[PDB]
């Protein structure tokens, strides 16, 4: 059915794990086939599994990415949630840290229908040697 | 104009301050007159300054503080993690929340959505 609050918390936390390990295949599996992704929010939405997989491919690729929850997943009783996390990756050839909040809405099958990632350069920090 | 990323960060941080001190009048001033509020998200949206002010009125022995940086976009929106301290069911309680806000070209809140539920509620048991 439609993910309960606790179920949302588990799903969104799993998402972060798949990202941390770069399991593109599993990430895309979590998405509905008609899902939309806006990342960073304010960019044109990307639609469907093909484009979503392409997005994760170029992002979780050649790069060198880590991600971890920095706080509890906030979950509603209508299949949505939001979570704070931190991403470690290379930005402009330098080791960087990005603070992000993702908002996700799930369908009655527990697949991500909508994901929106909130962050910009103000949330980017370039780490010293 | 439309709030820059840094401006969004400042506005959203100011919102939390007004809440912390319970300045209902100032809170409502931050909102556009036609703004919508969904709090908790998944509840029927509340529309306009009258209803919004009524919402904050009945809601506001409360404390609130940012627990992390405001995430801000380049299109006038942002999201922030924070913690609310209040009485829930006659007991001292803590609530973890994330608010997502979208601003208009006048720097007023057009849309606010508060993400939280009972899973994010913790009660301080009587000691």
UniProtKB/Swiss-Prot annotation, chain A:
Q: What induces it?
A: By steroids.
> Can you state which reaction this protein catalyses?
a 3-oxo-Delta(5)-steroid = a 3-oxo-Delta(4)-steroid
Q: What is its EC number?
A: 5.3.3.1
Q: InterPro entries recorded for this chain?
A: Ketosteroid_isomerase, NTF2-like_dom_sf, SnoaL-like
* Residues of the active site: 15, 39
* Keyword Magnesium applies: no
- Keywords (A to Z) from UniProt: Isomerase, Lipid metabolism, Steroid metabolism
- Chain residues that bind substrate: 102
Name a Pfam family for this protein.
Answer: SnoaL_2
Q: Which GO terms describe its biological process?
A: steroid metabolic process
Question: Main EC class of this protein?
Answer: isomerase
Q: Which SUPFAM superfamilies match?
A: NTF2-like
Q: Where is the signal peptide?
A: none
Q: Which cysteine pairs are joined by S-S bonds?
A: none
GO MF, one term, reads: steroid Delta-isomerase activity
Per UniProt, subunit arrangement is: Homodimer.
Q: What is this protein called?
A: Steroid Delta-isomerase
Which gene produces this protein?
Answer: ksi
Curated annotation (Swiss-Prot), chain B:
**Keyword Cell wall biogenesis/degradation attached:** no
Induction per UniProt is: By steroids.
Annotated binding of substrate, by residue: 99
What is annotated as the active site?
15 (proton donor), 39 (proton acceptor)
Catalyzed chemical reaction(s): a 3-oxo-Delta(5)-steroid = a 3-oxo-Delta(4)-steroid
Q: What is the effect of changing residue 56 to S?
A: Reduces activity 100-fold
Q: Which GO terms describe its molecular function?
A: steroid Delta-isomerase activity
Which InterPro entries did the record assign? Answer: Ketosteroid_isomerase, NTF2-like_dom_sf, SnoaL-like
Q: How is this protein organized at the quaternary level?
A: Homodimer.
Name of the featured protein = Steroid Delta-isomerase
